Write a protein that binds this DNA or RNA. Structure first.
Ligand SMILES: [Mg+2]
Ligand SMILES: [Mg+2]
Lengths: 150, 184, 24, 175, 196, 122, 95, 147, 52, 101, 244
RNA sequence: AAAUAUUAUGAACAAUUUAAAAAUUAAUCUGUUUAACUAAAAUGUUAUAUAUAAUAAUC
């Protein structure tokens, strides 16, 4: 018991649950920019962020307007009903990228044209399915006509 | 009929102890890291403890349980707010998943420094022990906000002229190793 | 709170709503 | 400018005197009345209503020996989740029920524990297949689901769980 | 181990008289000093070129006789003791030279502060803008501030007790080897730097 | 169902109850009385007339049934759950408040201060 | 470490039950996967479905995946109610 | 007291939305994602049984709908509907007559609105650049008498 | 500010929001008996050469 | 106060009443002005990082292309190398060696 | 101001959310009469919980774990058989799902028996759902294909083709959703409301059903060697897509 | 980021400053109105009447 734990060792990081407690629009534009980066707009909003040095710096800058709670990886695996033999990289790779507001584009015009390109890709998927069907039918007709000739 | 639901699977800890045994009681004082002052839990803290969002209809059973069932047992229908709340739950879930995955990727790459905090936190906190070994408007705005946030105060020019490139050396002659002086 | 020097004095309406009893 | 004239013309009968005789004076009066009533309903009515209901509940609790403060705190603790409107309705029409609620708050009855976090069954770590059977975790989940099905109200499915789980065996035709 | 381009701006310098400052040292210390300040020292007479004989032994200024009659042999224990004495004198000079700056919130234009300061905050700002690490136990407030700490707005001053005085023998040149007076100016600042 | 009650009993749910069959019948579905919100800015020239007919379903509660699953007799002044149940003896004896040590204790009437109670379960 | 419980290295109003009781119970109980051998013996059996690309089928030849069986644009009809909600617009589900 | 001290984990309870909702099979070994991407992809309400259909009570959007007028697509698809002169609608690019005031520095305002801060009227009825007495037509010289 | 009758809120409690000597009880009370010619109701302790 | 009729936005949250500025994360007027100035200066420095490249007669602005062409069209009739016409208007001298030069 | 949606945001009311009624067969025509023409040449049941179980079961079936989907379908099918009367919509549909699970597990004889029971229940059904009958007969076709009766499989597939060409309306699924692009009042930003599109594989599931049906028919024809049948099926499928 | 249209709403001293005022002020065009219905909601109750004091006696 008084000896160092043997066996292989694994790293366990942290995640921050950050809840805003004071009106951000009352403060200056720089703290509002930092809270916007932390994905907090109004008073009473709660977000979940990694424990990277960038997020640590942001929370250190806005430490007087938000309250933060720490949850290690094992604590998160206990809080959410996920077994221990399943990591989070696989879950992130499995969840779809088409989630609502996937990427913070630099302009609402860019946002609108991204949504428009998504709708265009859906329409192109449908018309390409139809055109591939037409191509396969045309090739079958050509092969059948050649066989009937020969 | 009725639904007694606290979690997803309707299971909860045994609410009633063994006959004759002493029952367990929650914490009445607020979750404060300091012993003083002793403060009773307010009703909003009680709601947060029991699982609500501080309001009767923000989270928990009062929002997740259906409101009406047909007499023959046919369930209710899906509403716009129901779908929006389900998407909000899934959004919280994917936020947590992506945060954990980013932490794992940083750990696998090696971008998690062994030194806790940041440079600003290390220059601001004495309790931290000393370690001894597209567009451009967004980037320039980030640089400006970094220059305005970092270095809140400067060493006076009489001690070290910052323009002459003079910076004072860290001194630990009178410091102590035990954190009691900073935690008490 | 109690306004200082520079803040102008504003007279608010007296709270006439019914108040609960201050039990010990 | 859209002055509400054709709509507020029909309410002039509620006014009296010159406001009811002439048109423009009555229209101005009705416009001001509706505007101030909307303002009061938006920003000041709820305060007075909730103060009234809170005072009534506090009086009902003081007639029993407690106060609004302690009653509200202990209701939040015991996790009863009764709005002040329902508390007033009980105090006015179900005095025995309200007194029983007060006795529950006053007694040293253990409040319910916090909701248990959803856990993963132990069978999820079992190798499957270990070398046409179902997963053990899935089977336990189905058993718990059927238990919860039978737990809600009486139905002709019966109280037993094995016979209801083994319904695919019944639907299967012997080859 | 410095880069050559950086070392070009510095020069090895042996200190004859103990000088306090970011470019100073103790009597009989070899250091890489910048060109301008090193030339100033050598013109004033406080520095000498680090020859081998000088690295072996040096003459130093005597405060009692006001002449360079103090011959000193550079040894390991002497270097250690003089480095410790220089550290003590530098801490004293830093805490006794300039002001300490505090910026907090105070609703209205009142004279007292919203949240009074404490020894922890004093030590925090000391380490922040002075680069001096001390424990809060050495900070002793005034007779009026023993109750609630620094509360007024404007200018105040606290006592800081330095234990290591008679061991190194500083009671001559220093004003008071027992304690030092830290002048702290408390002001109202914007939200981001007030934080309270 | 937060609570059920009758002329002799009351069952509370913290936070909810289970086993209560409260069946109603939807009588009608219509708009309520219109509330007219008239927003006018005294500075500019812009008046907004927003009508709010609060739509609502009127229902008539037909039947109410309750069938609980009691665990046992519970003590009030002590959190211990009793292992036995006796319908005759008081589960918690209650005594009057009259010490005599207090000289300024506001005295009520003697029968109000000394009035025992009956046994309901019998 | 693997074998030791996760709540052994924690640094930390006492004597009462907090809101995280059901979580600290699991944190105090010992870990299940106690070795990388068992970890990989569970991982190699763990499989994904929505993964873009082919999947191994050499296990059983008679079985056909639901994607191959009913195409990609088609999904089973789901019971839509207040209790359970299905995903909508599988065409919009992509990108 | 509005300064509450409690673990902010309680602000977002996860007891009601475990991993079984985001991945329905995560309890088992097989992993599959069944998520709701956003709030816009909502097919709408749907009946659970044939016996209990959804009501026919309508919202304002659906109720306040005028009759359908024949558009250019319909008149080009089935020309049997063009029976009157009101069917010959001009190009759909044309909105109609000008119904608002194009007030400078204020956009397009309704008629009868705020005429207080108005300068387009006086404009229809720069000095900061000519403050230094610098005429452009007199600054540069003429290359020739004819130009 | 005035938020009550002189029976409950004294006249020297109007400036209670301002910091200084007003937050204390005045020494002299000329409000009773005959009224002063200049209508002074209170007078605080004579601090040095100044009196309020 | 340049615009004297403030916009009224739709109130989705009650804190939109308490807030005064529309975009709080956006820097103020003078700050964003100096920010854009610094960004334009950085972009201009990136553009002028390399030496000032000289352009032929066709890739010239219209107010100089035709003049530079007519100043040498007389010599263009006789095809012989080594003929330069020192014209006044044109690309000024950078004053330092240039890789394009 | 851009929205982050970090808080709860209720959905917007949009015309694509209009509830659409399922297509019903006429009263005079019966599926058994059509099959003969082709051969010529309530008690209280916790339906919320059983629907939870059925949803979990179809999730299992989509994930691939077929035995658990089968047992879930069996449980909820016993529930529906006890609840609903003879020849009901959800009853026949869940037993279709049960037969599909049996076939995905390998009990092909029981799958065929269950699907023939579905057929004899659609016999007595007064106005069966067009989508339900199409999916049921597609299930029977795929079960016949798995057994090896490819002729009968493609026969059922062309039966689906005939039914949906005869008694189905193709323009109903896009009645209210075709004029939505005219709601576009902005062009520089938010102009996707002018390019809104709704794939037909979502708003009328019978279309995707017959699409996959004719796809499997084309695969069977290519495997057999009936180029005429393959050409016919592809022509009919392309014609359906063009109609939509 | 462009193509367009207009732009007169107007301070005098002092202090600090290659870093931050001061208490006899700096800065702000004051603190601008503005909210679909129903409910919920955490926002500051007063006084403490001076121990270097007050109250008493002898020499
Ligand atoms: Mg209201
Ligand atoms: Mg511009």
């Amino acid at each position: 018991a008084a000896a160092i734990a043997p066996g292989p060792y694994r790293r366990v990081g942290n995640i921050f649950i950050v809840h805003c407690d004071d009106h951000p629009f009352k403060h200056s534009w720089e703290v509002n920019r930092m809270l916007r980066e932390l994905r907090l707009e109004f008073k009473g909003q709660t977000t979940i962020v990694p424990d990277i040095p960038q997020v640590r710096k942001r929370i250190w800058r806005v430490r007087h307007i938000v309250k933060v709670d720490v949850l290690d990886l094992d604590e998160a695996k206990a809080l959410i009903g996920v077994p221990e033999h399943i990591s989070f990289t696989d879950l992130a790779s499995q969840l779809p990228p088409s989630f609502g507001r996937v990427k913070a584009v630099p302009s609402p015009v860019i946002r609108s044209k991204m949504n428009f390109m998504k709708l265009r890709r859906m329409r192109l998927r449908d018309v390409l399915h139809r055109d591939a069907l037409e191509l396969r039918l045309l090739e079958l007709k050509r092969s059948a006509m050649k066989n009937x000739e020969q | 009929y009725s639904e007694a639901r606290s979690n997803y699977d309707g299971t909860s800890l045994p609410a009633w102890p063994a006959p004759g045994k002493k029952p367990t009681y929650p914490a009445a004082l607020s979750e404060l890291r300091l012993p003083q002052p002793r403060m009773r839990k307010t009703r909003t803290e009680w709601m947060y403890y029991h699982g609500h969002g501080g309001c009767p209809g923000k989270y928990g059973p009062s929002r997740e349980i259906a409101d009406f069932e047909y007499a023959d047992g046919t369930p209710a229908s899906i509403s716009g707010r129901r779908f929006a709340f389900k998407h909000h739950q899934d959004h919280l879930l994917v936020q947590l998943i992506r945060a954990a995955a980013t932490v794992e990727r940083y750990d696998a790459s090696g971008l998690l420094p062994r030194i806790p905090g940041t440079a600003e936190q290390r220059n601001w906190d004495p309790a931290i022990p000393l370690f001894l070994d597209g567009t451009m408007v967004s980037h320039v705005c980030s640089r400006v906000v970094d220059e305005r946030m970092g270095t809140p105060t400067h060493t006076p020019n009489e001690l070290a002229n910052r323009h002459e490139g003079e910076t004072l050396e860290a001194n630990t002659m009178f410091a102590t190793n035990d954190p009691s002086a900073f935690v008490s | 709170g109690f306004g200082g020097f520079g803040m102008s004095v504003y007279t608010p309406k007296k709270d006439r709503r019914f108040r609960v009893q201050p039990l010990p | 400018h859209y002055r509400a004239k054709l709509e507020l013309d029909r309410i002039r009968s509620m006014l009296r005197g010159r406001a009811r005789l002439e048109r423009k004076v009555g229209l101005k009066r009705l416009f001001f009345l509706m505007r101030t009533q909307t303002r009061y309903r938006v920003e000041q009515q709820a305060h007075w209503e909730r103060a009234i209901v809170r005072k009534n509940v506090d009086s009902a609790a003081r007639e029993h020996g407690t106060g609004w403060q302690h009653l509200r705190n202990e209701l939040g603790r015991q996790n009863v989740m009764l709005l002040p409107r329902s508390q007033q309705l009980l105090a006015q029409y179900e005095p025995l029920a309200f007194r029983a609620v007060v006795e529950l708050c006053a007694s040293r009855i253990p409040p319910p524990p916090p909701p248990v976090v959803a856990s993963v069954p132990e069978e999820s770590y079992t190798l499957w297949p270990p070398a046409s059977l179902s997963h053990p975790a899935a089977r336990v989940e189905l058993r718990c689901g059927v238990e919860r099905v039978l737990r809600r109200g009486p139905s002709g499915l019966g109280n037993n769980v094995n016979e209801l789980i083994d319904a695919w065996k019944e639907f299967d035709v012997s080859p | 181990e410095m880069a050559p381009e950086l070392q070009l701006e510095y020069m090895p310098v042996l200190f004859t008289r103990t000088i306090l400052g970011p470019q100073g040292g103790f009597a009989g210390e070899e250091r890489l000093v910048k060109l301008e300040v090193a030339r100033k020292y050598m013109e004033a007479g406080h520095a000498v070129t680090p020859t081998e004989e000088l690295r072996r032994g040096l003459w130093c200024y005597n405060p009692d006789t006001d002449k360079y009659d103090c011959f000193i042999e550079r040894n390991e224990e002497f270097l250690d003791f003089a480095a410790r004495k220089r550290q003590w004198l530098d801490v004293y000079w830093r805490v006794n030279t300039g002001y300490l700056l505090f910026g907090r919130q105070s609703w209205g234009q009142g004279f007292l502060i919203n949240c009074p300061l404490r020894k922890r905050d004093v030590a925090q700002k000391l380490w922040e803008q002075y680069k001096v690490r001390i424990d809060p136990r050495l900070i002793e407030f005034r007779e009026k501030d023993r109750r609630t700490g620094i509360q007024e707005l404007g200018h105040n001053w606290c006592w800081l007790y330095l234990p290591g005085a008679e061991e190194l023998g500083i009671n001559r040149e220093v004003y008071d080897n027992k304690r030092v007076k830290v002048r702290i100016h408390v002001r109202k600042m914007n939200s981001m730097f007030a934080l309270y | 169902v937060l609570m059920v009650g009758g002329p002799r009993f009351t069952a509370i749910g913290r936070p909810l109850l289970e086993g209560v069959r409260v069946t109603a019948q939807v009588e009608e579905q219509k708009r309520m009385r219109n509330v007219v919100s008239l927003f006018a800015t005294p500075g500019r020239r812009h008046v907004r007339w927003v009508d709010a007919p609060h739509a609502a379903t009127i229902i008539r509660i037909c039947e109410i049934f309750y069938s609980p699953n009691v665990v046992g007799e519970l003590d009030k002044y002590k959190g211990e759950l009793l292992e036995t149940f006796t319908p005759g003896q008081h589960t918690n004896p209650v005594y009057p408040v009259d010490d005599g040590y207090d000289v300024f204790r506001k005295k009520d009437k003697e029968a109000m201060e000394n009035a025992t109670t009956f046994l309901d379960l019998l | 470490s693997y074998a030791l419980p996760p709540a052994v290295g924690r640094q930390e109003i006492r004597g009462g039950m907090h809101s995280s009781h059901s979580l600290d119970l699991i944190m105090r109980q010992p870990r299940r996967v106690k070795t990388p051998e068992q970890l990989r013996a569970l991982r190699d059996r763990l499989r994904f479905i929505g993964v873009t690309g082919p999947m191994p089928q050499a296990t059983s030849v008679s079985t056909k995946s639901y994607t191959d069986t009913y195409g990609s644009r088609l999904r089973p009809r789901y019971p839509e109610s207040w209790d359970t909600v299905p995903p909508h617009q599988p065409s919009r589900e992509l990108l | 007291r509005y300064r509450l001290f409690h673990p902010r984990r309680e602000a977002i309870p996860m007891h009601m939305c475990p991993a079984k909702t985001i991945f329905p099979l995560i309890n088992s070994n097989n992993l599959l994602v069944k998520t709701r991407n956003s709030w816009e992809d909502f097919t709408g309400r749907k009946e659970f049984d044939e016996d209990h259909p959804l009501p026919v009570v309508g919202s304002r959007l659906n109720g306040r709908t005028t009759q359908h007028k024949w558009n250019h697509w319909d008149q080009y698809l089935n020309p049997q509907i063009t029976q009157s002169i009101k069917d010959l609608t001009p190009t759909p690019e044309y909105v109609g007559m000008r119904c608002g005031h194009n007030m400078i520095k204020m956009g397009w305002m309704k008629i009868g609105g705020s005429w207080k801060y108005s300068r387009g009227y006086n404009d229809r009825r720069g000095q900061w650049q000519e403050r230094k007495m610098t005429p452009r037509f007199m600054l540069a010289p003429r290359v020739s008498a004819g130009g | 500010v005035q938020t009550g009758s002189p029976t409950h809120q004294r006249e020297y409690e109007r400036f209670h929001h301002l910091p200084g000597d007003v937050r204390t009880r005045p020494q002299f009370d000329f409000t009773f008996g005959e009224t002063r010619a200049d209508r002074v109701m209170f007078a605080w302790r004579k601090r040095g050469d100044l009196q309020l | 106060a340049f615009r004297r009729l403030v916009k009224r936005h739709k109130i989705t949250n009650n804190q939109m009443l308490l807030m005064r500025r529309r975009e709080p994360y956006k820097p103020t007027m003078k700050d964003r002005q100096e920010i854009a100035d610094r960004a334009k200066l950085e972009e201009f420095e990136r553009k002028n990082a390399d030496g000032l490249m000289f352009v032929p007669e066709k890739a010239l602005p219209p107010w100089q292309k035709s003049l530079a062409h007519n100043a040498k069209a007389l010599g263009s009739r006789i095809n012989f190398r080594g003929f330069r016409v020192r014209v006044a208007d044109g690309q000024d001298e950078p004053g330092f060696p240039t890789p394009f030069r | 101001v851009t929205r982050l949606y970090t808080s709860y945001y209720t959905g917007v009311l949009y015309p694509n959310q209009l509830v659409q009624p399922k297509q019903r067969l006429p009263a005079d025509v019966s599926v058994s009469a059509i099959l003969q023409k082709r051969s010529e040449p309530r008690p209280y049941v916790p339906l919320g919980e059983v629907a939870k179980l059925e949803l979990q079961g179809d999730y299992y079936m989509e994930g691939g774990m077929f035995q658990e989907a089968l047992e879930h379908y069996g449980v909820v099918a016993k529930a529906y058989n006890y609840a609903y009367p003879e020849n009901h919509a959800q009853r026949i549909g869940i037993r279709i799902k049960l037969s599909a699970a049996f076939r995905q597990t390998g009990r092909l004889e029981s799958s065929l028996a269950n699907i023939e029971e579905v057929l004899r229940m659609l016999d007595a059904s007064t106005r069966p759902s067009l989508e339900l009958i199409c999916e049921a007969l597609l299930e029977l076709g795929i079960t016949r294909e798995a057994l090896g009766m490819k002729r009968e499989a493609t026969e059922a597939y062309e039966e689906a083709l005939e039914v949906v060409n005869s008694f189905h309306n193709w323009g109903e699924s896009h009645r209210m959703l075709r004029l939505l692009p005219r709601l576009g009042r902005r062009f520089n930003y938010n102009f996707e409301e002018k390019f809104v599109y709704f794939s037909p594989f979502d708003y009328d599931r019978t279309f995707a059903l017959v699409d996959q049906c004719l796809e499997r028919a084309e695969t069977i024809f290519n495997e057999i060697g009936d180029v005429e049948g393959a050409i016919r099926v592809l022509q009919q499928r392309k014609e359906m897509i063009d109609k939509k």
